[PDB]
Every structure is written in structure tokens, then in C-alpha cells.
RNA sequence: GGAUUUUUGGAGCAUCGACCUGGUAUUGCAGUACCUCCAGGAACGGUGC
């Protein structure tokens, strides 16, 4: 089946999320679509490479398997799958 | 045979679970699952260098999990 | 059994696999160790490098978080559910 | 079921983990490389495909440095070792 | 404050129930060592209030040699007492009894049925003091010391029995050597068994045993406690002999057995007394350590099953037939009825009888459906 | 076994960076289920200021940690 | 209730510093219009009141802590465990002594 | 009504508007403050919002506390053992209280981690010279009544009380 | 329940966030990586090698 924070994470397509990935950059960005396997895709993303340095991509794609955390936004916290 | 079949049948018996990260938590595991999920109750942890905190509920998992010490008062030809 | 599912929307804390841990509502939990933590706050601690230097703790608040089964090692219940 | 256990008994006697079936047969010690450099040498219990190893009075020794490393050992009665942290595993030891 | 005549009687009354608590629990019989174990705790902590409760009364005397020549006194008298009354007649409008004045201390001094423990012992645990395998007393748990035994001679060529074997000599020769560091060693397994001693007995005088151990340490173990027949006067710290008691006298008060030497009496005096204490451990619990062993040899030579059987021990109703429907009667004080048929066989009733016979209707058939009061009155009062 | 969503990225430009602080740049030419991707064109950056041309290469998916797209896409 | 229970342990504090019987300091209390209720023993609470003045008389003993200090009770605790086991045994004789009586009854 | 720990378990405690964990106990008129370490240093932020709290004191070691409220009181005087159980304090709310001698922020000062500080509406700001010996007590607070530290402030601070 | 995305293991330099001083235009209604620019000092800290 489908895992709860999977569908979590699949309802949060179309806000502005932000993953991290396993050598500590942070890319926060609008998420276009995502996948069961932890797969971000995510536009207008902010990448930061471990250092600070926030550069601006367009159209990036992170694997499940260096995506450490995926913060959502606020809105997605009255959602019923959750309750 | 599977060992986690013989790990799943251990109740409120005080283990020492020796993480991969440097982390060892000595406590009376309360819960075993297929998944080598460990659910104890009033363990100590010790980091890497640090000092050994008290917590009253632990959950910790399979994969992050790299020994385990069982006591001595436990035989093993009955959990096999 | 239901062990894992005992300790849901409580004030929980997760350590990391990096370190780090993440203290907030675990909501919503899966068969691959994810956790749905509302209002998560991740705190790292961060290296002295000197002789007189104390070690100190970064906190930072993220809000809802999508911690997956990879990064996470051990999680303890710190709050009750307000 | 029943061919199963059979076909696991044959992979067990004859394959990559029948040096360990020695450790089961005439209760020889073995010793095994962890990840995090810690050797431990003692009589395997019981074992499983997944090289989940279950220790009775093993020795864990490692080094530790303060210089030069010390080798500080331990003595654990009884133990259970997870066959990801499993490296090498020696069937007869030196000593 | 009356801290002379009010003060040390209520210390005496203290003592007195404290007294009367004991005799309770040791005329009360046990079923099981646990529960034994934690009477007995419960008696020491018990005893060690009395005590403490005694050392503090007995401090309030010095005030009291001075007082007592005012107080036996045939002069003075009923001018400080008309004095303190006038001082205790103030408001008396808190109408509220205190009951509580001495049977608050049998109420704390005593237990409850569902758990057999005092008012102060109540956050005391047998679980906090002992561990799982020592069994509240029964046995003693030697595998730690067994491992770090294995540990420290560096060799798996030793059992439990041969550990066990090895710790019951007293006054043999050891098993390695005594500047060794297996001293570190016997002094935390002496450390241990202390605590041990102290835990199988919580009764009995600690410090006065601890006080007799040091002064049989003292006076007999440091002037030649085993006599001969080199062999007729030996040193527990310099480890040699002696031809004579006048020559090991001689030798006492030497510079090598001063401080010259690494096993004089300056340095390893303390692992010679965690010796000493381990031998009387050993001497004082030789019955626990042989139910020890022999629970060892039994979980050895049993099997796995044995092993492991030794160490786990409507709606519908109330919706059909009217009920669960507010009525008000305003006879019988505006009492509530869930039914239309409930409330009419209440009506030919005692309590609607006893309603209406305060208003003086008589009990008739008229009255059956009357509700109100002026309406029964109005009734009552048109026949 | 669900297949990623490349079709995106495919026969685009984009820029992928692998572990150990390694990054390629390339165009995508498939997809595979264990997220392995091939590149054509593909120029690899080291932590100098040249770069070293490949022609083609196929990268694994236990390596690949994030991959943005150059072109619109 | 309280302050019925400060005025008798008041009068039995006054009453056990005299040298005599009837000449006390609650006997000329009561000529000097001092309404006092619990001295007479017709009322339940000269039971209670009789019982602090002998209260207040064991505390003035000699060895009650006025000049002397008691050491086999409060440094001693196998005194303490005799003398609750002597208590014991008193009480068992005593119902030995009361069962008796009942089947001496019966 | 005396605080407890009930009245802080049956607190609402959630997230501020500093993306903090705060616990709201406005409305309670406290005389004393008391029993604190209920939290077990899960709090950011405690507000003290309408109490009656004459002295602020009876703090308990909280590590994790980095804001405080102590608006709207009647706090006349200061405890000196704030420095010891709370090390890592940065923010101070101590508007509209009842200090008036200069003498009550003396301890205010032995806070070394201690950056904001609000002092509004009180009777010891309309004494001459108020900010002067705020600042040449505590050198570490940055923010004074929402108001930065000055150069010249720090200079004429230095120059008085010599 | 063992084969790449979760569970039988890859185990002095660059950048960013601050702190303090002066000139400068915007006086404006909104659910947020970050928002004016220049010049001077720093004996502040995190991350990777």
C-alpha cells in the first residue's frame, strides 16, 4: 500500500517544500510532482551545498535515497490523514 | 532459520543495544517486531563521547542498530 | 504489533543518523520508518575546536517535517500531546 | 516448507556460510570484523542467511588511542551481532 | 513554644508509635522474601526516623535546666496561664474539626491492603536496590565478575565454576599475584559484596559492624592474625615471613614496610582492608554464596526449556417504550421521571403518598394525574 | 519497482551531481527503474576550472543525489 | 476542635508542675471566674485530659530527657527490635489470655 | 489561586510568532512563581502575561528558556539567582512594573548571554541618567527598550561613575 | 523480508550568518529562502577539505 507520510508527501505537491540531502544542502522550492520512493521534483529551487551559498536552480530533481528530511509547509497540517 | 524470530520473543529483559553511530542504550526492551524494531522502556544512552542520558521510552530501529549484549540468565537453545 | 503506533501526535525526538535531533508532533508513521513531525524544531551540536571553548547546540523550527527511515536511529518521547 | 528447509540446510552445509556451520558442528570459535574495527573471536549459537550471528562468551577487542593505541578488549557472555556490520569472518583464529 | 513539655511528649508519642508500627510488623507473619525484604526495609527506615526523632529530643535539654526553676515554681503559676489564655481567646468562627491530632501519625505509620507499605516508604522499590538475577537476597549475581576476571588474566581457560572455585578460599594462597592489578579488581568485587551484605540485612547494625571489621582489622589483622608453628608469623602486606614476634616487631616500623617498598602499609593499606572485607563478606554470606553456586550448577546442568522455564519466573428498548423522556412533577419537589408509564406507576406510590400527605390530601383516585400543588389543593378543597 | 518521472528531462540538457562532491553535465538519453541514467555529451567538473569530456556515461542511482535541469524543460 | 484540645494540653501542662494534689494551678483557676469545664470527671473529655497529664508527667521523668540522655533507644537498634519483639510476645499472651477468656465464657 | 504544576500542565503550549515553543499563562494573577520544571526544558518562551507577581524569583535551572515575559506585573524587586538557571536567556520583557530605585537592575547585569531587554513604562526610567547606567551595568545587552546601543551612549556611560 | 530510492552499512582555503559607525530614496496593506546602495573597523561563529 501507501505509507501515511508518503501520502503526506504526495498531498504537499504544489507548495513551497524544502528537502535536504544527504551532504547538507537544503533546496527549498514549489513541488511540482512527487513519487512514493521519496522522489522530489521541485521548481524555483534554492540550493545551498552545504555552505550557505543559496543559488538559484530551475527544474531540480532529488532522490529518495540522499533525501534526508522534507520540511512542508504550515497549510498541510489540518490535513486528514493525519488527524 | 531467521534470528529476528528469536529476537521477537524477548520481553522486559535488560539489553544493551550498541548503535553504529557510538550509541549504546542499556535498558528493558519491551517490544521486538520482524523489522528488528526495539521498543524499551526506562534505558540509559550513551553517546560517542558524551554522557549517558535517561530517557523513560526508546524506539530504535533495525538498521541503525549494530550489536546487541543479552544478560547472562538467558538460554539460547529454547529461543532457536 | 502496535508499538510504534503507542507514542502517535506526542511530543517526540528523533536522532539522526548525522547527529542532529528532531523534537515535534510525530503525526503520521509508515512500515519504513518515516515520521510526520508537526512543529519539529532540529537541534545539531556544533564542535568547541579550542581548549576553553564550550560545546554548544544550534536549534532551528521547520514546522512540519518528513523525516524518512534512512537518516533516523532512535526515537524518545520528551512531551505529552497538548 | 519442507524443500525449502532443505534447500537452506544444503546452502548452510555447503555454501559460504558452512565455515560457519563449523562453528556449529564442533562448537569451534570464530572470529568476526565489525565495522567500527572491533574484532570479536567466540562460539557461534545460531546464524541465519542474513549472517545474523548470535555470540556465546565472544571477546571483543579493539583499538583505542589515548601516543600510542592501547588494545582495550571486553568479555560479553551473551550477544547478538547483525550480519550488516559483518566484514570478515574467520573460521580458525591464531589465537 | 513549649519545647519541654509540649515538644518531647509529642516526640515521645512519635517514638511510641514508631514502637507500636514494629511490633506490628513483627508479630505479622511472612509468605514471601520480596515482601519480607521490604518489611524489613521498611522497619530499618523506621528505626532510622526513631533514631533521628531521638537525637533531636534529646538535644532540647539545655534551655530546660534553666526553665526548671521557673517551672516548678509555687509563686508563679496561674498568672502566665490566665495570661495564655487571654492570648487563646481569639475568633473561634473556623467551625472545623481536627481529628488528625494523633491518628495522622497511625494512619502514616501503617499500610493499605492493595500495597503492603507505609505513608514515608511509599516511593520505596526492591527493584532499585537489587537486580533480577540476585533475586531480593536468595542469590548473588557473579557474572560480571566473572567477566572481568576473564578480562583482567586475559585468558578463557576459566569458568564460573573455576571463578567460583577461586573466590571460596579465604585464607589460601591466590590465584595471581597481590601487586598485580587483580587488587583492582577485588576491591570493587569487595565494594560489591559489601553492599550486598548491607542489602540481605537492612535490619541490622551497619556502622556497628563496620566499627568491629575495622577494629578486628586493626588490633588482630595487623599484629599476625594467623599464627605458626617464616612460617610463624606472615604479613598481609609486605608478603614475608618472620622467625619471631620480636623480630617481626623489629620489622614493623622498618623503612621498606613504612613506605619503601609498592605493597608497604602507606599505599596498600586500603586494598589490604578491601581484602579483609571481602574475606568477612565471605565468611559472614558462605550460605548465600553456596545457594549461589548451586543455582549456578543447576541452570548449567539443566537444559533450554528447563532454562527457560526457571528464568521466567439500547436505544431501541428506551425509544420504543417511551423512556429516556424528561417529565417534571412538581409534588414530590419537582422530581424528574424518564416515562409517561414510569411516572403514572410512581403516582400510586409511597413517595407520591408521602408528598401529598404534607399538603394533608388524603390518598385517593381523584389526585391520580394532579401535578401541581395548587391544582391538588383546589382539588382537595372542592370536595 | 515504479519507475522514476524523467520523461521531463529527457533529451535535455541538465547537470547532475554525484557523491564525493562529483558533478556531471549532459544530456539525458534514458531512464532506468533503479534511477540510472545515461548522458551523452556528458562533461565532467572537477574542483579545478577544466573540465574533462566523457562522450557518453552512465551513472548509477545509489550515486546520483540531485540532478537540475539546465533547459526549460 | 482544636482549640478545646490547646486548653486541655494547657491545663494538663499547669497541672503537672505542682507539688500537690489539690493545691495545682487549675484548683484556684477555677475560684478566679475561669469557666473550665474539664476538670470535672463526669464529662468524656476528663478521660483525654487525664491521660495528658500523666503524659505530662512521663515527660518530666528523670529519664525522659531532662537529665539524662537515653542511649539503648536511640543508639541501639537491637534494643529497639527486642523491645518490639517483647511487645509482641505481650500482645500475643494477651490474646492467648482473651481467646481463654472466651472459651472460658462459651 | 497559588501556581502549580497544574496550572502549567493545563497551559496551552504551541508554537509563537518567533518560531519558538511558547506556553501561554495569561490571565492567572500568580503571586509567586513556582514549580517551573515541569517542562523539562521542552520551552523557548514563557509568558507571565496579568500576574501578581510581586518578586521575580524561584526559577528553576532551565537551559532551554531563551525568552521572557514579565509584562503587565507588579514585580518591585529582582532576584539575584536569574543568572544560574537560566544561561542561555537572550530576551527580557520586564515592562510595566515597579522598579524604582536604580539598584534593582544590578543583577539584571549578571546575565553575560543577555542581548534584548525592555524596560518600558517603568518609575526607574524617569530618573536622569537611566539608560546611561543600563548600559554601563549590563555591556552585553544589545537591545535596550527596542532601542540599539549607541557609541556615544557607551562613552558617556564609560565617563559617568568613574 | 538480504542486490542501486528507505530495513541486513560507504564504513591554511572557499562560502554563509552576524556586530558597530556616517550619507542616501521609499511613508508603502499582507501571508515570506534574502531584500536600497556605498565607505571604514572587527581581537564573532557554523559547514566541507
Same mark, same amino acid.
Given at each position: ?10 498531498? +504537499? ?20 510532482? +512527487? ?19 543559496? +543559488? ?22 489540518? +490535513?486528514?490523514?493525519?488527524? | ?10 520481553? %522486559? ?12 542504550? %542499556? ?11 526495539? %521498543? ?41 | ?23 515535534? *508532533? ?49 526515537? *524518545? ?6 | ?95 | ?77 496561674? =498568672? ?35 500495597? &503492603? ?6 516511593? &520505596? ?53 597481590? =601487586? ?35 577494629? !578486628? ?5 595487623? =599484629? ?51 581484602? &579483609? ?5 565471605? !565468611? ?78 388524603? =390518598? ?16 382537595? &378543597?372542592?370536595? | ?42 562533461? $565532467? ?22 540532478? $537540475?535541469?539546465? $533547459?526549460?524543460? | ?20 494534689? #489539690? ?25 483525654? #485530659? ?16 531532662? #537529665? ?39 | 489561586?497559588? @501556581? ?18 511558547? @506556553? ?11 514549580? @517551573? ?30 525568552? @521572557? ?94
Amino acid at each position: 500500500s501507501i505509507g501515511v507520510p508518503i501520502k503526506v508527501l504526495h498531498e +504537499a505537491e504544489g507548495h513551497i517544500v524544502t528537502c535536504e540531502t544527504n551532504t547538507g544542502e537544503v533546496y527549498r522550492g514549489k513541488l511540482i510532482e +512527487a513519487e512514493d520512493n521519496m522522489n522530489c521534483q521541485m521548481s524555483n529551487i534554492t540550493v545551498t551545498y552545504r555552505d550557505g551559498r543559496v +543559488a538559484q536552480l530551475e527544474q531540480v530533481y532529488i532522490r529518495g535515497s540522499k533525501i534526508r528530511f522534507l520540511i512542508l509547509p504550515d497549510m498541510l497540517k489540518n +490535513a486528514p490523514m493525519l488527524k | 532459520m531467521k534470528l529476528v524470530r528469536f529476537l521477537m520473543k524477548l520481553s %522486559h529483559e535488560t539489553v544493551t543495544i550498541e548503535l553504529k553511530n557510538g550509541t549504546q542504550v %542499556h535498558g528493558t526492551i519491551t517490544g521486538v517486531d520482524v523489522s528488528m524494531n526495539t %521498543h524499551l522502556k526506562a534505558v540509559k544512552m550513551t553517546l560517542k563521547n558524551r554522557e549517558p542520558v535517561q530517557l523513560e521510552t526508546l524506539s530504535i530501529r533495525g538498521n541503525n542498530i549494530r550489536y546487541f549484549i543479552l544478560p547472562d540468565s538467558l538460554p539460547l537453545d529454547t529461543l532457536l | 504489533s502496535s508499538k510504534m503506533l503507542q507514542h502517535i501526535d506526542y511530543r517526540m525526538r528523533c536522532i539522526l543518523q548525522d547527529g542532529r535531533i528532531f523534537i515535534g *508532533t510525530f503525526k503520521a508513521f509508515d512500515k519504513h520508518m518515516n515520521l510526520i513531525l508537526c512543529d519539529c524544531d532540529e537541534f545539531r551540536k556544533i564542535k568547541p575546536k579550542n581548549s576553553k571553548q564550550a560545546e554548544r547546540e544550534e536549534k532551528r523550527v521547520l514546522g512540519l517535517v518528513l523525516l524518512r527511515g534512512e537518516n533516523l536511529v532512535s526515537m *524518545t518521547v520528551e512531551g505529552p500531546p497538548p | 516448507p519442507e524443500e525449502l528447509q532443505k534447500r537452506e540446510e544444503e546452502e548452510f552445509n555447503t555454501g559460504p556460510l558452512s565455515v560457519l556451520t563449523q562453528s556449529v558442528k564442533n562448537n569451534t570459535q570464530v572470529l568476526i570484523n565489525c565495522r567500527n574495527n572491533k574484532k570479536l573471536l567466540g562460539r557461534v549459537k545460531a546464524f541465519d542467511r542474513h549472517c545474523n550471528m548470535v555470540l556465546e562468551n565472544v571477546k571483543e577487542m579493539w583499538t583505542e588511542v589515548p601516543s600510542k593505541p592501547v588494545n582495550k578488549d571486553r568479555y560479553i557472555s551473551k550477544m547478538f551481532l547483525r550480519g550488516d556490520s559483518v566484514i570478515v569472518v574467520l573460521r580458525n583464529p591464531l589465537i | 513554644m513549649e519545647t519541654i513539655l509540649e515538644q518531647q511528649r509529642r516526640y515521645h508519642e512519635e517514638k511510641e508509635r514508631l514502637m507500636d508500627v514494629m511490633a506490628k510488623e513483627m508479630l505479622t507473619k511472612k509468605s514471601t522474601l520480596r515482601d519480607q525484604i521490604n518489611s524489613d526495609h521498611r522497619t530499618r527506615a523506621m528505626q532510622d526516623r526513631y533514631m533521628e526523632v531521638s537525637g533531636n529530643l534529646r538535644d532540647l535539654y539545655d534551655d530546660k535546666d534553666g526553665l526548671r526553676k521557673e517551672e516548678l515554681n509555687a509563686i508563679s503559676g496561674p =498568672n502566665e496561664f490566665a495570661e495564655f489564655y487571654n492570648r487563646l481567646k481569639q475568633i473561634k468562627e473556623f467551625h472545623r474539626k481536627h481529628p488528625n491530632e494523633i491518628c495522622v501519625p497511625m494512619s502514616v505509620e501503617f499500610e493499605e491492603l492493595l500495597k &503492603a507499605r507505609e505513608n514515608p516508604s511509599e516511593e &520505596a522499590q526492591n527493584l532499585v536496590e537489587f537486580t533480577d538475577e540476585e533475586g531480593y537476597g536468595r542469590y548473588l549475581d557473579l557474572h560480571d565478575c566473572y567477566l572481568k576476571y576473564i578480562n583482567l588474566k586475559a585468558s578463557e581457560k576459566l569458568d564460573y565454576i573455576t571463578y567460583l572455585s577461586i573466590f571460596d578460599q579465604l585464607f589460601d594462597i591466590p590465584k595471581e599475584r597481590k =601487586n598485580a592489578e587483580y587488587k583492582r579488581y577485588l576491591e570493587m568485587l569487595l565494594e560489591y559484596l559489601q553492599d550486598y551484605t548491607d542489602r540481605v540485612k537492612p535490619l541490622q547494625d551497619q556502622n556497628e559492624l563496620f566499627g568491629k571489621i575495622q577494629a !578486628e582489622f586493626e588490633k588482630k589483622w595487623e =599484629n599476625g592474625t594467623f599464627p605458626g608453628w617464616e612460617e610463624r608469623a606472615q604479613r598481609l602486606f609486605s608478603t614475608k615471613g618472620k622467625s619471631l614476634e620480636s623480630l617481626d616487631t623489629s620489622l614493623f616500623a622498618k623503612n621498606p614496610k613504612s613506605k619503601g617498598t609498592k605493597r608497604d602499609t602507606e599505599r596498600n593499606k586500603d586494598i589490604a582492608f578491601l581484602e &579483609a572485607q571481602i574475606y568477612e563478606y565471605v !565468611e559472614i554470606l558462605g550460605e548465600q554464596r553456596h545457594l549461589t553456586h548451586e543455582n549456578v550448577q543447576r541452570k548449567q546442568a539443566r537444559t533450554g526449556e528447563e532454562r527457560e522455564e526457571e528464568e521466567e519466573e439500547p436505544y431501541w428498548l428506551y425509544k420504543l417504550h417511551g423512556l429516556n423522556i424528561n417529565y417534571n412533577c412538581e409534588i414530590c419537589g419537582n422530581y424528574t421521571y424518564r416515562g409517561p408509564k414510569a411516572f403514572q406507576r410512581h403516582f400510586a406510590e409511597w413517595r407520591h403518598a408521602h408528598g401529598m400527605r404534607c399538603l394533608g390530601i388524603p =390518598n385517593t383516585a381523584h389526585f391520580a394525574n394532579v401535578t401541581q400543588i395548587e391544582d391538588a389543593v383546589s382539588l382537595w &378543597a372542592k370536595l | 519497482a515504479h519507475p522514476p518521472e524523467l520523461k521531463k528531462f529527457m533529451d535535455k540538457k541538465l547537470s547532475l551531481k554525484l557523491n564525493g562532491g562529483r558533478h556531471v553535465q549532459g544530456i539525458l538519453r534514458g531512464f532506468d527503474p533503479f534511477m540510472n541514467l545515461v548522458i551523452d555529451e556528458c562533461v $565532467e567538473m572537477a574542483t579545478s576550472g577544466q573540465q574533462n569530456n566523457i562522450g557518453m556515461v552512465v551513472i548509477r542511482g545509489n550515486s546520483i543525489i540531485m540532478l $537540475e535541469a539546465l $533547459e526549460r524543460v | 476542635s482544636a482549640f478545646d484540645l490547646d486548653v486541655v494540653k494547657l491545663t494538663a501542662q499547669f497541672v503537672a508542675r505542682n507539688g500537690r494534689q #489539690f493545691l495545682t494551678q487549675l484548683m484556684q483557676k477555677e475560684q478566679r471566674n475561669y469557666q473550665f469545664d474539664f476538670l470535672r470527671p463526669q464529662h468524656s473529655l476528663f478521660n483525654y #485530659f487525664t491521660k495528658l497529664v500523666e503524659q505530662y508527667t512521663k515527660i518530666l521523668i528523670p529519664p525522659k530527657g531532662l #537529665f539524662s540522655k537515653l542511649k539503648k533507644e536511640a543508639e541501639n537498634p537491637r534494643e529497639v527490635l527486642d523491645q518490639v519483639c517483647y511487645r509482641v510476645e505481650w500482645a500475643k499472651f494477651q490474646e492467648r489470655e482473651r481467646k481463654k477468656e472466651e472459651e472460658e465464657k462459651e | 489561586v497559588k @501556581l502549580t504544576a497544574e496550572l502549567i500542565e493545563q497551559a496551552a503550549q504551541y508554537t509563537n510568532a518567533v518560531r519558538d515553543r511558547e @506556553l501561554d499563562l495569561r490571565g492567572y494573577k500568580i503571586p509567586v512563581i513556582e514549580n @517551573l520544571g515541569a517542562t523539562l526544558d521542552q520551552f523557548d518562551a514563557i509568558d507571565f502575561s496579568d500576574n501578581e507577581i510581586r518578586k521575580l524569583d524561584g526559577f528553576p535551572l532551565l537551559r532551554r528558556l531563551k525568552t @521572557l515575559l514579565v509584562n503587565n506585573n507588579r514585580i518591585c524587586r529582582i532576584g539575584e539567582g536569574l543568572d544560574q538557571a537560566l544561561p542561555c536567556l537572550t530576551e527580557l520583557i520586564l515592562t510595566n512594573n515597579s522598579l524604582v530605585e536604580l539598584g534593582d537592575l544590578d543583577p539584571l547585569a549578571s546575565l553575560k548571554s543577555l542581548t534584548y531587554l525592555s524596560i518600558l513604562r517603568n518609575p526607574v526610567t524617569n530618573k536622569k541618567h537611566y539608560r546611561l547606567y543600563v548600559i554601563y551595568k549590563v555591556p552585553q545587552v544589545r537591545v535596550l527598550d527596542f532601542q540599539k546601543v549607541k557609541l556615544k551612549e557607551r562613552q558617556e556611560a564609560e565617563k559617568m561613575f568613574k
